[PDB]
Ligand binder design. Structure first.
Ligand code: NI
Length: 341
């Protein structure tokens, strides 16, 4: 049974609610983004209307085989009427195709559902500038002050400089980057660009990247592993055993691996600057964990909410424990007393 924080009151709508069977009264199912915790339940046998971005709809059709007649892509930044209710999709600054949804309810209430997002000051100049929001359904993944991490631009600067130095010292080094979902593509695309290489990957991963509307993608990626000196591997293989096993398969072309594991936040963020990050090393294999986040830091979240001034907040992450719920409610009240709304 579908929980309350996935229902939009006064509508026939749900958000990210595909794992509960037929939801009573639902006339349109919204999907914010193509991550498995959110699409859990969709397949080729789904027969209700799904509303989403263009990119999400390319993934539903090619990767999950949802039939074309049930996929309803909407443009961004554009007022659309769905089943008699005005909606807008906004870029969530999460993974490719990810959106926030603004719902203009028939009674005059306005609701923003963030989906998953990484808040940014540029959102203060979207269509959100124009009017008041009564209810915010908020991605609270990192809602605690300990959750700090650098900008995505600083992280990419570190990865490009680390890879270019290593391969210039040793032209026979291979670079490997872990992946287990869409998102974070700038890590492997930026490193391959500085090295003058295409990115090599499986047929399954190539298919996924081909759904993402990335400009000039045919110039950037390939299934011919032998031609490429940046390879993608599943995240589970990014360890000393998996990497050893991969280097054997390369026919003595390489004698060293440098590997990256993009994570979210880890507790080594509480002590170390991005500049000071060091790898784990065994023999001719080195592994860097880099804190590339596609969710808001505490401070980015707080700035967004203090600017929006919602009348009510409903968290969508960390909702399963009393202690998490209590902690998040305290910070929402601090933010409101500090800013005066
Ligand atoms: Ni996500």
């Amino acid at each position: 049974t579908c929980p309350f924080y996935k229902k939009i009151p006064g509508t026939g709508f749900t958000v990210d609610a595909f794992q509960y069977g037929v939801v009573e009264g639902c006339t349109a199912y919204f999907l914010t983004h193509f991550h498995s915790d959110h699409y859990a339940g969709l397949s080729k046998h789904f027969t209700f209307p799904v509303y989403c971005s263009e990119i999400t709809g390319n993934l539903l059709k090619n990767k999950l085989h949802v039939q074309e007649q049930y996929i309803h892509p909407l443009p961004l930044d554009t007022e659309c009427i769905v089943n008699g209710v005005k909606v807008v999709l906004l870029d969530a600054n999460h993974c490719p195709g990810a959106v926030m949804i603004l719902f203009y309810l028939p009674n005059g209430t306005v609701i923003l559902h963030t989906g998953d997002f990484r808040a940014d000051p540029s959102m203060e100049r979207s269509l959100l500038a124009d009017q008041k929001v009564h209810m915010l359904y908020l991605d609270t993944t990192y809602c605690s002050p300990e959750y700090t991490f650098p900008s995505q631009q600083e992280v990419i600067r570190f990865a490009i400089n680390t890879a270019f130095e290593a391969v210039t010292l040793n032209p026979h080094a291979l670079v490997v980057c872990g992946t287990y979902s869409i998102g974070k593509e700038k890590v492997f695309l930026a490193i391959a660009d500085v090295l003058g290489s295409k990115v090599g990957m499986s047929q399954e991963k190539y298919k996924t990247l081909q759904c993402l509307n990335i400009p000039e993608i045919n110039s950037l990626i390939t299934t011919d592993m032998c031609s490429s000196l940046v390879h993608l591997l599943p995240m589970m293989q990014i360890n000393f055993k998996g990497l050893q096993s991969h280097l054997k398969k390369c026919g003595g072309k390489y004698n060293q691996i440098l590997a990256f594991r993009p994570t979210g936040w880890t507790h080594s963020n509480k002590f170390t600057r991005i500049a000071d990050v060091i790898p784990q090393t065994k023999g001719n294999i080195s592994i860097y964990g880099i804190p590339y986040s596609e969710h808001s830091s505490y401070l980015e979240m707080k700035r967004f909410v203090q600017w929006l001034k919602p009348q009510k907040i409903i968290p969508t992450v960390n909702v399963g424990t009393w202690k998490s719920r209590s902690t998040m409610e305290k910070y929402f009240r601090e933010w409101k007393l500090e800013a005066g709304y």
